[PDB]
Amino acid sequence: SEVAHRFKDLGEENFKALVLIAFAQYLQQCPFEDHVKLVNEVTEFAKTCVADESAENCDKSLHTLFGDKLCTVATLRETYGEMADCCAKQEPERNECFLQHKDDNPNLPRLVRPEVDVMCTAFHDNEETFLKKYLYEIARRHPYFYAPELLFFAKRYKAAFTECCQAADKAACLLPKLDELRDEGKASSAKQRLKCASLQKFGERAFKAWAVARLSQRFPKAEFAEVSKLVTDLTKVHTECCHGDLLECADDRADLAKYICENQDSISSKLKECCEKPLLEKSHCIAEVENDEMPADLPSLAADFVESKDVCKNYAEAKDVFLGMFLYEYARRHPDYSVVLLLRLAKTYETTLEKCCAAADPHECYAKVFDEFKPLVEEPQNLIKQNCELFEQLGEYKFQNALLVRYTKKVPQVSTPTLVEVSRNLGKVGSKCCKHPEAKRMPCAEDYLSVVLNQLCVLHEKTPVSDRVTKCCTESLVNRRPCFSALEVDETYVPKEFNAETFTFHADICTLSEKERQIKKQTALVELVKHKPKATKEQLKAVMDDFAAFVEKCCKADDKETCFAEEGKKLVAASQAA
């Protein structure tokens, strides 16, 4: 019994939360109360199997059990779309059909969260329903959220209410805690999304290399054998979560944390604090732990990998293993290389080996092999430095504006809502990474950009429109950032025609938060660039600063809707022909 073995490993609460997550992530348009019905129906069944594993439908597979459950309120086709396609299939076709339809940007109302007193009462009203709603609202907006990570966020959400709803000042306690959980979820969701796209679109081999490199940097004292066992385990975890096998994923991650803690002296010295936290927290803490110390006396890699007359011997007998060894040995020596660089380097090393091992004198042929890494190492360094300078000149907001511009010209066809967010997320790179010195700056900034750019990819994949985005995303996971960076302005793009209502704001803009108000304006910056591309300058930084003053004055004038239409019909001639 598969469902019974997971109930017992995971315990009832996590079992219930994870099933609710799965259902919320397969069926994003279905209402809360219906998902709760299905969950409890499964929980009941799962209990009967715990008592008797050989009972009726207990031999069933998790995908069968769950897919049978979705398909009871999924034939309602005019409510959630084409999920009645999926219900007409047998597993595992049905399951893969469900996963196909996951919506990276499901068109769902933003959550207008109630006042603190009202939230706090509903929390005391019914704690378990209140906490379920958190789970359900995150998961259906983030269909690829790292599920065991969501349980951890759920716990801290619970604790934020448990603490702050007793506070003398409820709101001054609660609100900073909720805003940190929100920002930290976005970041978590985006990071995980990159993981699932790697697996789905580039295979197990690419994710493992990603993990061989990242864990090598983080646990540099560990032997290759130990690192390898960790990669195999990590891969199985994320292969499960990225395929909706949530129960088995939460479970193998819990087994993995245990193993790592039990073998702390064979892995890293930074793990002490982590391994004595509660398990939900411990797993999160291991995944985010700082890189350990490099062993002192590590020798040149030129010996094992260039000098030796047996490089083509050792390569021949186990290619992936030999190349994995190269990646571990190189990645553990460079904490200051981003993960994607380290993968480029190993791409180069291999492709040099595929040639030279066939030539008459291999030794001579690959003696210069390390000499090719240099221009690869130098480019991401050059890019960061220049952008880290432009950031601190302009500051974070104005930084996004230059990037808005840069990217809107790069790929003008891209939908405005996508350019806004992705460029907004791009400028957040200076806040996170320019802070650092140039040894922590590249693992920080390049791997983050990886994650942001993959977001543009996954949102463009919905309704593809730019052939340039499409190509950069498809050709090679590892070179998404170099290739996006190489993109010049698009010449065969023809200006997007002046629209009076795209540039005229309304009084409703005054009641929105400052961070929603910038978005309406950076949205206007994008349309501005789309309607006036190959002929601008600082008439973008000029016109944009008029919008700020536009909205500033009109929002305080006691008008009869008057101001936003008066300075709205006149100033448009300062964005039409000025």
PDB file of all heavy atoms in Angstrom, residues 36-60:
ATOM      1  N   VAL A  36     -11.077  20.831  -0.315  1.00  0.00           N
ATOM      2  CA  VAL A  36     -11.074  20.341   1.056  1.00  0.00           C
ATOM      3  C   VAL A  36     -11.879  19.051   1.134  1.00  0.00           C
ATOM      4  O   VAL A  36     -11.492  18.110   1.835  1.00  0.00           O
ATOM      5  CB  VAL A  36     -11.590  21.391   2.058  1.00  0.00           C
ATOM      6  CG1 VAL A  36     -12.022  20.737   3.346  1.00  0.00           C
ATOM      7  CG2 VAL A  36     -10.516  22.433   2.317  1.00  0.00           C
ATOM      8  N   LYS A  37     -12.970  18.992   0.379  1.00  0.00           N
ATOM      9  CA  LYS A  37     -13.767  17.776   0.317  1.00  0.00           C
ATOM     10  C   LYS A  37     -12.933  16.592  -0.178  1.00  0.00           C
ATOM     11  O   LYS A  37     -12.982  15.500   0.399  1.00  0.00           O
ATOM     12  CB  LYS A  37     -14.985  17.981  -0.581  1.00  0.00           C
ATOM     13  CG  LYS A  37     -15.840  16.729  -0.753  1.00  0.00           C
ATOM     14  CD  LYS A  37     -17.136  17.040  -1.506  1.00  0.00           C
ATOM     15  CE  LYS A  37     -18.012  15.795  -1.686  1.00  0.00           C
ATOM     16  NZ  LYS A  37     -19.288  16.084  -2.421  1.00  0.00           N
ATOM     17  N   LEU A  38     -12.144  16.819  -1.224  1.00  0.00           N
ATOM     18  CA  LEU A  38     -11.371  15.749  -1.832  1.00  0.00           C
ATOM     19  C   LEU A  38     -10.259  15.266  -0.889  1.00  0.00           C
ATOM     20  O   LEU A  38     -10.057  14.062  -0.725  1.00  0.00           O
ATOM     21  CB  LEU A  38     -10.793  16.206  -3.192  1.00  0.00           C
ATOM     22  CG  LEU A  38     -11.816  16.677  -4.248  1.00  0.00           C
ATOM     23  CD1 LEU A  38     -11.152  17.336  -5.469  1.00  0.00           C
ATOM     24  CD2 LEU A  38     -12.766  15.536  -4.677  1.00  0.00           C
ATOM     25  N   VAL A  39      -9.546  16.221  -0.289  1.00  0.00           N
ATOM     26  CA  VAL A  39      -8.533  15.939   0.727  1.00  0.00           C
ATOM     27  C   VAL A  39      -9.051  15.035   1.844  1.00  0.00           C
ATOM     28  O   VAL A  39      -8.520  13.952   2.058  1.00  0.00           O
ATOM     29  CB  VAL A  39      -7.966  17.241   1.346  1.00  0.00           C
ATOM     30  CG1 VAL A  39      -6.989  16.931   2.499  1.00  0.00           C
ATOM     31  CG2 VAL A  39      -7.284  18.060   0.278  1.00  0.00           C
ATOM     32  N   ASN A  40     -10.099  15.469   2.533  1.00  0.00           N
ATOM     33  CA  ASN A  40     -10.654  14.673   3.623  1.00  0.00           C
ATOM     34  C   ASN A  40     -11.129  13.310   3.152  1.00  0.00           C
ATOM     35  O   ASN A  40     -10.947  12.303   3.841  1.00  0.00           O
ATOM     36  CB  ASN A  40     -11.764  15.425   4.353  1.00  0.00           C
ATOM     37  CG  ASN A  40     -11.347  16.820   4.740  1.00  0.00           C
ATOM     38  OD1 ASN A  40     -12.095  17.793   4.553  1.00  0.00           O
ATOM     39  ND2 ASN A  40     -10.135  16.936   5.261  1.00  0.00           N
ATOM     40  N   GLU A  41     -11.708  13.270   1.958  1.00  0.00           N
ATOM     41  CA  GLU A  41     -12.072  11.987   1.366  1.00  0.00           C
ATOM     42  C   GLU A  41     -10.860  11.075   1.178  1.00  0.00           C
ATOM     43  O   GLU A  41     -10.979   9.860   1.291  1.00  0.00           O
ATOM     44  CB  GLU A  41     -12.804  12.186   0.040  1.00  0.00           C
ATOM     45  CG  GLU A  41     -14.294  11.894   0.113  1.00  0.00           C
ATOM     46  CD  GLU A  41     -15.093  12.644  -0.935  1.00  0.00           C
ATOM     47  OE1 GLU A  41     -14.464  13.229  -1.847  1.00  0.00           O
ATOM     48  OE2 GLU A  41     -16.344  12.662  -0.835  1.00  0.00           O
ATOM     49  N   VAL A  42      -9.693  11.648   0.894  1.00  0.00           N
ATOM     50  CA  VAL A  42      -8.510  10.820   0.681  1.00  0.00           C
ATOM     51  C   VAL A  42      -7.928  10.440   2.039  1.00  0.00           C
ATOM     52  O   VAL A  42      -7.579   9.286   2.284  1.00  0.00           O
ATOM     53  CB  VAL A  42      -7.441  11.517  -0.211  1.00  0.00           C
ATOM     54  CG1 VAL A  42      -6.151  10.720  -0.223  1.00  0.00           C
ATOM     55  CG2 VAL A  42      -7.959  11.727  -1.647  1.00  0.00           C
ATOM     56  N   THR A  43      -7.864  11.416   2.932  1.00  0.00           N
ATOM     57  CA  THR A  43      -7.419  11.173   4.289  1.00  0.00           C
ATOM     58  C   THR A  43      -8.202  10.034   4.959  1.00  0.00           C
ATOM     59  O   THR A  43      -7.610   9.201   5.659  1.00  0.00           O
ATOM     60  CB  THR A  43      -7.520  12.451   5.125  1.00  0.00           C
ATOM     61  OG1 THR A  43      -6.705  13.465   4.526  1.00  0.00           O
ATOM     62  CG2 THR A  43      -7.069  12.193   6.578  1.00  0.00           C
ATOM     63  N   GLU A  44      -9.519  10.001   4.742  1.00  0.00           N
ATOM     64  CA  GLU A  44     -10.350   8.927   5.292  1.00  0.00           C
ATOM     65  C   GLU A  44      -9.888   7.610   4.710  1.00  0.00           C
ATOM     66  O   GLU A  44      -9.579   6.674   5.444  1.00  0.00           O
ATOM     67  CB  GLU A  44     -11.839   9.131   4.974  1.00  0.00           C
ATOM     68  CG  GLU A  44     -12.716   7.887   5.253  1.00  0.00           C
ATOM     69  CD  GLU A  44     -14.225   8.115   5.013  1.00  0.00           C
ATOM     70  OE1 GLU A  44     -14.617   9.252   4.666  1.00  0.00           O
ATOM     71  OE2 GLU A  44     -15.021   7.153   5.177  1.00  0.00           O
ATOM     72  N   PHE A  45      -9.835   7.551   3.383  1.00  0.00           N
ATOM     73  CA  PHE A  45      -9.386   6.350   2.707  1.00  0.00           C
ATOM     74  C   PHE A  45      -7.994   5.932   3.176  1.00  0.00           C
ATOM     75  O   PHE A  45      -7.754   4.757   3.433  1.00  0.00           O
ATOM     76  CB  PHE A  45      -9.397   6.533   1.190  1.00  0.00           C
ATOM     77  CG  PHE A  45      -8.926   5.324   0.450  1.00  0.00           C
ATOM     78  CD1 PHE A  45      -9.733   4.209   0.348  1.00  0.00           C
ATOM     79  CD2 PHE A  45      -7.664   5.287  -0.113  1.00  0.00           C
ATOM     80  CE1 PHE A  45      -9.288   3.079  -0.323  1.00  0.00           C
ATOM     81  CE2 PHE A  45      -7.221   4.164  -0.779  1.00  0.00           C
ATOM     82  CZ  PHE A  45      -8.026   3.061  -0.881  1.00  0.00           C
ATOM     83  N   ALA A  46      -7.083   6.894   3.293  1.00  0.00           N
ATOM     84  CA  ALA A  46      -5.705   6.591   3.674  1.00  0.00           C
ATOM     85  C   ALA A  46      -5.629   5.975   5.076  1.00  0.00           C
ATOM     86  O   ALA A  46      -4.779   5.116   5.343  1.00  0.00           O
ATOM     87  CB  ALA A  46      -4.843   7.832   3.592  1.00  0.00           C
ATOM     88  N   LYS A  47      -6.519   6.415   5.963  1.00  0.00           N
ATOM     89  CA  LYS A  47      -6.643   5.804   7.278  1.00  0.00           C
ATOM     90  C   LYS A  47      -7.101   4.340   7.212  1.00  0.00           C
ATOM     91  O   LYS A  47      -6.512   3.480   7.863  1.00  0.00           O
ATOM     92  CB  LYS A  47      -7.573   6.622   8.166  1.00  0.00           C
ATOM     93  CG  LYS A  47      -6.913   7.823   8.827  1.00  0.00           C
ATOM     94  CD  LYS A  47      -7.971   8.779   9.341  1.00  0.00           C
ATOM     95  CE  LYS A  47      -7.418   9.660  10.444  1.00  0.00           C
ATOM     96  NZ  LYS A  47      -8.388  10.703  10.909  1.00  0.00           N
ATOM     97  N   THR A  48      -8.126   4.040   6.416  1.00  0.00           N
ATOM     98  CA  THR A  48      -8.556   2.643   6.260  1.00  0.00           C
ATOM     99  C   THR A  48      -7.419   1.709   5.787  1.00  0.00           C
ATOM    100  O   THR A  48      -7.344   0.550   6.220  1.00  0.00           O
ATOM    101  CB  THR A  48      -9.788   2.498   5.349  1.00  0.00           C
ATOM    102  OG1 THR A  48      -9.374   2.481   3.981  1.00  0.00           O
ATOM    103  CG2 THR A  48     -10.780   3.643   5.578  1.00  0.00           C
ATOM    104  N   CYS A  49      -6.524   2.227   4.942  1.00  0.00           N
ATOM    105  CA  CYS A  49      -5.363   1.475   4.460  1.00  0.00           C
ATOM    106  C   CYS A  49      -4.271   1.270   5.504  1.00  0.00           C
ATOM    107  O   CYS A  49      -3.567   0.263   5.471  1.00  0.00           O
ATOM    108  CB  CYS A  49      -4.748   2.153   3.225  1.00  0.00           C
ATOM    109  SG  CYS A  49      -5.820   2.190   1.771  1.00  0.00           S
ATOM    110  N   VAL A  50      -4.109   2.236   6.407  1.00  0.00           N
ATOM    111  CA  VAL A  50      -3.198   2.084   7.560  1.00  0.00           C
ATOM    112  C   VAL A  50      -3.588   0.903   8.472  1.00  0.00           C
ATOM    113  O   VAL A  50      -2.734   0.106   8.868  1.00  0.00           O
ATOM    114  CB  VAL A  50      -3.098   3.392   8.394  1.00  0.00           C
ATOM    115  CG1 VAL A  50      -2.139   3.215   9.558  1.00  0.00           C
ATOM    116  CG2 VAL A  50      -2.638   4.545   7.518  1.00  0.00           C
ATOM    117  N   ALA A  51      -4.879   0.794   8.781  1.00  0.00           N
ATOM    118  CA  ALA A  51      -5.431  -0.346   9.524  1.00  0.00           C
ATOM    119  C   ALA A  51      -5.322  -1.680   8.768  1.00  0.00           C
ATOM    120  O   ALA A  51      -4.942  -2.699   9.353  1.00  0.00           O
ATOM    121  CB  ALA A  51      -6.875  -0.072   9.885  1.00  0.00           C
ATOM    122  N   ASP A  52      -5.667  -1.666   7.476  1.00  0.00           N
ATOM    123  CA  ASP A  52      -5.545  -2.854   6.621  1.00  0.00           C
ATOM    124  C   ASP A  52      -4.943  -2.502   5.244  1.00  0.00           C
ATOM    125  O   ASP A  52      -5.638  -1.980   4.370  1.00  0.00           O
ATOM    126  CB  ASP A  52      -6.906  -3.557   6.475  1.00  0.00           C
ATOM    127  CG  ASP A  52      -6.812  -4.901   5.747  1.00  0.00           C
ATOM    128  OD1 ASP A  52      -5.684  -5.419   5.565  1.00  0.00           O
ATOM    129  OD2 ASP A  52      -7.872  -5.447   5.356  1.00  0.00           O
ATOM    130  N   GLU A  53      -3.653  -2.790   5.065  1.00  0.00           N
ATOM    131  CA  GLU A  53      -2.936  -2.432   3.836  1.00  0.00           C
ATOM    132  C   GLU A  53      -3.395  -3.265   2.648  1.00  0.00           C
ATOM    133  O   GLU A  53      -3.196  -2.881   1.499  1.00  0.00           O
ATOM    134  CB  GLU A  53      -1.409  -2.577   3.999  1.00  0.00           C
ATOM    135  CG  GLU A  53      -0.715  -1.440   4.781  1.00  0.00           C
ATOM    136  CD  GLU A  53       0.770  -1.242   4.404  1.00  0.00           C
ATOM    137  OE1 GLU A  53       1.290  -1.994   3.551  1.00  0.00           O
ATOM    138  OE2 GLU A  53       1.418  -0.324   4.960  1.00  0.00           O
ATOM    139  N   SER A  54      -4.001  -4.413   2.929  1.00  0.00           N
ATOM    140  CA  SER A  54      -4.457  -5.307   1.870  1.00  0.00           C
ATOM    141  C   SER A  54      -5.942  -5.104   1.580  1.00  0.00           C
ATOM    142  O   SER A  54      -6.556  -5.892   0.851  1.00  0.00           O
ATOM    143  CB  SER A  54      -4.183  -6.772   2.229  1.00  0.00           C
ATOM    144  OG  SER A  54      -5.192  -7.283   3.082  1.00  0.00           O
ATOM    145  N   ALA A  55      -6.510  -4.039   2.142  1.00  0.00           N
ATOM    146  CA  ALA A  55      -7.913  -3.704   1.906  1.00  0.00           C
ATOM    147  C   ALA A  55      -8.176  -3.358   0.432  1.00  0.00           C
ATOM    148  O   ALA A  55      -7.301  -3.525  -0.419  1.00  0.00           O
ATOM    149  CB  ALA A  55      -8.352  -2.572   2.826  1.00  0.00           C
ATOM    150  N   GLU A  56      -9.376  -2.856   0.138  1.00  0.00           N
ATOM    151  CA  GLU A  56      -9.855  -2.760  -1.241  1.00  0.00           C
ATOM    152  C   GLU A  56      -8.893  -2.081  -2.223  1.00  0.00           C
ATOM    153  O   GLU A  56      -8.105  -2.755  -2.893  1.00  0.00           O
ATOM    154  CB  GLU A  56     -11.243  -2.114  -1.289  1.00  0.00           C
ATOM    155  CG  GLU A  56     -12.090  -2.520  -2.509  1.00  0.00           C
ATOM    156  CD  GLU A  56     -13.597  -2.395  -2.257  1.00  0.00           C
ATOM    157  OE1 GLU A  56     -14.145  -3.202  -1.466  1.00  0.00           O
ATOM    158  OE2 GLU A  56     -14.236  -1.498  -2.853  1.00  0.00           O
ATOM    159  N   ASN A  57      -8.949  -0.760  -2.314  1.00  0.00           N
ATOM    160  CA  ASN A  57      -8.173  -0.058  -3.330  1.00  0.00           C
ATOM    161  C   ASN A  57      -6.845   0.445  -2.799  1.00  0.00           C
ATOM    162  O   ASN A  57      -6.338   1.466  -3.257  1.00  0.00           O
ATOM    163  CB  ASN A  57      -8.980   1.106  -3.894  1.00  0.00           C
ATOM    164  CG  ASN A  57     -10.345   0.679  -4.367  1.00  0.00           C
ATOM    165  OD1 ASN A  57     -10.519  -0.424  -4.890  1.00  0.00           O
ATOM    166  ND2 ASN A  57     -11.332   1.542  -4.169  1.00  0.00           N
ATOM    167  N   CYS A  58      -6.284  -0.280  -1.838  1.00  0.00           N
ATOM    168  CA  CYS A  58      -5.073   0.149  -1.142  1.00  0.00           C
ATOM    169  C   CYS A  58      -3.796  -0.136  -1.914  1.00  0.00           C
ATOM    170  O   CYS A  58      -2.753   0.483  -1.668  1.00  0.00           O
ATOM    171  CB  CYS A  58      -4.993  -0.528   0.226  1.00  0.00           C
ATOM    172  SG  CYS A  58      -6.098   0.199   1.442  1.00  0.00           S
ATOM    173  N   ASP A  59      -3.881  -1.090  -2.833  1.00  0.00           N
ATOM    174  CA  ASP A  59      -2.754  -1.440  -3.683  1.00  0.00           C
ATOM    175  C   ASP A  59      -2.592  -0.386  -4.773  1.00  0.00           C
ATOM    176  O   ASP A  59      -1.610  -0.383  -5.502  1.00  0.00           O
ATOM    177  CB  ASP A  59      -2.951  -2.836  -4.298  1.00  0.00           C
ATOM    178  CG  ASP A  59      -4.174  -2.914  -5.203  1.00  0.00           C
ATOM    179  OD1 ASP A  59      -5.165  -2.201  -4.933  1.00  0.00           O
ATOM    180  OD2 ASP A  59      -4.142  -3.684  -6.191  1.00  0.00           O
ATOM    181  N   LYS A  60      -3.562   0.514  -4.871  1.00  0.00           N
ATOM    182  CA  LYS A  60      -3.568   1.533  -5.913  1.00  0.00           C
ATOM    183  C   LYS A  60      -2.307   2.402  -5.829  1.00  0.00           C
ATOM    184  O   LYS A  60      -1.655   2.459  -4.778  1.00  0.00           O
ATOM    185  CB  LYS A  60      -4.808   2.404  -5.750  1.00  0.00           C
ATOM    186  CG  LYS A  60      -5.616   2.642  -7.004  1.00  0.00           C
ATOM    187  CD  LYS A  60      -6.566   1.500  -7.298  1.00  0.00           C
ATOM    188  CE  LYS A  60      -8.006   1.982  -7.244  1.00  0.00           C
ATOM    189  NZ  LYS A  60      -8.967   0.914  -7.648  1.00  0.00           N
TER     190      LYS A  60
END
